[PDB]
Homo-oligomer: A and B are copies of this chain.
Amino acid sequence: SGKIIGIDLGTTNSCVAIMDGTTPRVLENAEGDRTTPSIIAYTQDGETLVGQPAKRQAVTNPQNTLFAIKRLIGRRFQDEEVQRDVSIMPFKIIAADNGDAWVEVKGQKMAPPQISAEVLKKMKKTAEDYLGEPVTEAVITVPAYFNDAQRQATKDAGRIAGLEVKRIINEPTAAALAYGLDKGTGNRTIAVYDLGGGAFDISIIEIDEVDGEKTFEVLATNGDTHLGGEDFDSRLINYLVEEFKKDQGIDLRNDPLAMQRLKEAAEKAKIELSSAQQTDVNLPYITADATGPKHMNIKVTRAKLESLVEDLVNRSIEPLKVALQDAGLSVSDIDDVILVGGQTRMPMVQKKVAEFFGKEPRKDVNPDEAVAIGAAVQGGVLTGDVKDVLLLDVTPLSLGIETMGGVMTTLIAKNTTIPTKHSQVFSMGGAVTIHVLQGERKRAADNKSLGQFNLDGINPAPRGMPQIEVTFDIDADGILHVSAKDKNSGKEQKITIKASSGLNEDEIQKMVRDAEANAEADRKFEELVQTRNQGDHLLHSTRKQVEEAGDKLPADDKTAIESALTALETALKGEDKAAIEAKMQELAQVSQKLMEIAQQ
């Protein structure tokens, strides 16, 4: 029921769009912005902030401001990428009971999906405000190269935000839909290069015309889910730290407030250098010595920046080679190169991509909104409102199992179209344990473990010829479902999953409840503000009452009202709701009383 909204859930920024009849439309949030910072904050006085208001206070509240959670979602605490971030992020990353990467704020342990849910809730309310009705269904995006755990965790985030996730869509696939909607963009093969704040994807996509309908088929995809603008910032931040150290003999790294200011300045400097050739990093009072306060002032040329990050850019080119190889195409077969993501605005990035493909990328694709638009289009394909549009996507990673010898044995190859199904007999009745992994490496140890899937034996029985057949389904969301049955009896076999990543049903239900309690807490927190606004109205009117009385007002009555006015003003300067309400009440009584005497 209701509209299926399309939500680009980004590492850095999020964006929501709808189908406006036949045309997709990106919606402005309450702040009037077409994108929303993927930032969640908890204030000292216990408030939860999302988007711009959260971003604004990060500099003074670095420990309790959560950002880039998409780089933790669906990951394990002991993951190399996470272990590195543990030392870098200003907030506290911890291990959950099952070993998953979680965060801790003010003693409270939280799962990444709970945090991302807060962003999704804001995108949901954005759509609801615009539409004037409830929204309960959504298409949510994920990087094409997201693995099973990352996908499911993102889907879980949608549920926690109160959204039925009708489809998890791969981000380059969404961008392709947006690009291809334009009549006259058909029968061509495109390369979608998406470099965002956290992840990098490359997809090769064929747009065709079959039976009057436009078809989109992903031929191959590749990338790196932990390669993005955050990493460019980090290179620049480290440089600035080192230069200040050499210059002023002070190491800013143990100073949380300094490092937060530096992070902000570094990203601004990076962004400036996409258009200017030099930028100035200025941070007055960045620290203090026994000698007095110190100020950071350092010029950074584009040349310097490029030397600090060139290898990151080069890291994005290698998957391009694999994607083309997997697609069975050469650059010459690519009709259009499409850039998506804010980090593609870097001249070096554009130049490297153009040089690789031997052609200039298109300029007529919105790098901030194409993904959300495509998500909305996908929604409209689901609701039947978008006609003559079909898509066929793939799974990005080989699905395999660890077999005797510690080897990775592939069951479903990367770039297989989805949904897809593979069935195999694993046992003639004995108990079975299946170690399922995703990746292309030859050794199981070098791939991503999804878990151990255990089946009990089937007991011997006259005329029983047990054949335990295990089926591996990958759905339209790109998510695995393992089931089993005895072909001989047709009886379903229960699978017990051990050592897997992710939230269980009980946790999810609790986190759904917790999100609702947060919303209730938010409405509560608002009470004070509402009361403050009422106080200002009351002050405004009662001051007019004094003025209108002029001299007709007795000294004692005038003294009383003026005392009540000042007392309310003082209370409003404070944070005590009871005191404010009490002073409003007393002012109202004095106003009423004088009114009555005036009438006398």
Contact = CB atoms under 8 A, between A and B. Distances in A.
A38 to B, nearest CB: 18
B276 A532 contact: no
A304 interface: yes
A303 interface: yes
A530 B130 contact: no
A56 to B, nearest CB: 9
Given A274-B32, A536-B307, A301 B529 contact: yes
A533 interface: yes
B25 A364 contact: yes
A123 to B, nearest CB: 15
A457 interface: no
A278 B540 CA distance: 16
Contact of A275 (B31, B364, B532): B31
A345 B307 CA distance: 43
A101 B30 CA distance: 39
A302 interface: yes
Interface in A1-57: 20, 25, 30-32, 53
Interface in A265-291: 271-272, 274-278
Contacts of A535: 301
A534 interface: yes
A523 interface: no
Q: Which of A20, A53, A303, A364 has the most CB of B within 10 A?
A: A303
A342 B130 CA distance: 17
A148 B307 CA distance: 55
A529 B299 CA distance: 10
Contacts of A302: 533
Contact of A276 (B25, B53, B271): B53
Contacts of A32: 271, 274-275, 342, 345
A533 B363 CA distance: 27
Interface of A: 20, 25, 30-32, 53, 130, 271-272, 274-278, 299, 301-304, 307, 342, 345, 363-364, 526, 529-530, 532-537, 540, 572-573
Given A25-B364, A307-B540, A364-B25, A277 B345 contact: no
A275 to B, nearest CB: 4
Contacts of A276: 53, 529
A53 B269 CA distance: 12
The 3 tightest CB contacts between A and B, nearest first, are: A303-B536, A303-B533, A30-B275
Contacts of A534: 303
Contacts of A271: 32
A532 B303 CA distance: 9
9 contacts: A32-B274, A32-B345, A277-B526, A278-B532, A299-B572, A301-B529, A302-B533, A303-B532, A307-B537
Nearest to A573: B299
Given A277-B532, A301-B533, A303-B532, 9 more contacts: A30-B275, A31-B272, A31-B274, A32-B342, A277-B529, A299-B572, A301-B529, A303-B533, A307-B536
B533 A277 contact: yes
B307 A277 contact: no
A284 to B, nearest CB: 10
A272 B31 CA distance: 7
A372 to B, nearest CB: 16
A159 B32 CA distance: 35
A310 B566 CA distance: 24
A537 B305 CA distance: 11
A88 to B, nearest CB: 25
Contacts of A342: 32
A301 B532 contact: yes
A90 B275 CA distance: 29
Contacts of A537: 303, 307
Nearest to A29: B275
A362 to B, nearest CB: 11
Nearest to A538: B303
A572 B274 CA distance: 21
Contacts of A526: 277
Contacts of A272: 31
Nearest to A20: B364
A329 to B, nearest CB: 27
B20 A277 contact: no
Contacts of A130: 363
Contact of A533 (B278, B345, B572): B278
Nearest to A533: B303
Given A30-B275, A276-B53, A277-B530, A536 B345 contact: no
A366 to B, nearest CB: 9
A302 B529 CA distance: 10
A81 B405 CA distance: 86
Nearest to A25: B364
A526 B534 CA distance: 55
Nearest to A27: B363
Contacts of A53: 276
Nearest to A302: B533
A40 B275 CA distance: 17
A231 to B, nearest CB: 20
Contacts of A345: 32
Nearest to A32: B345
Nearest to A541: B307
Contacts of A25: 364
A439 B504 CA distance: 73
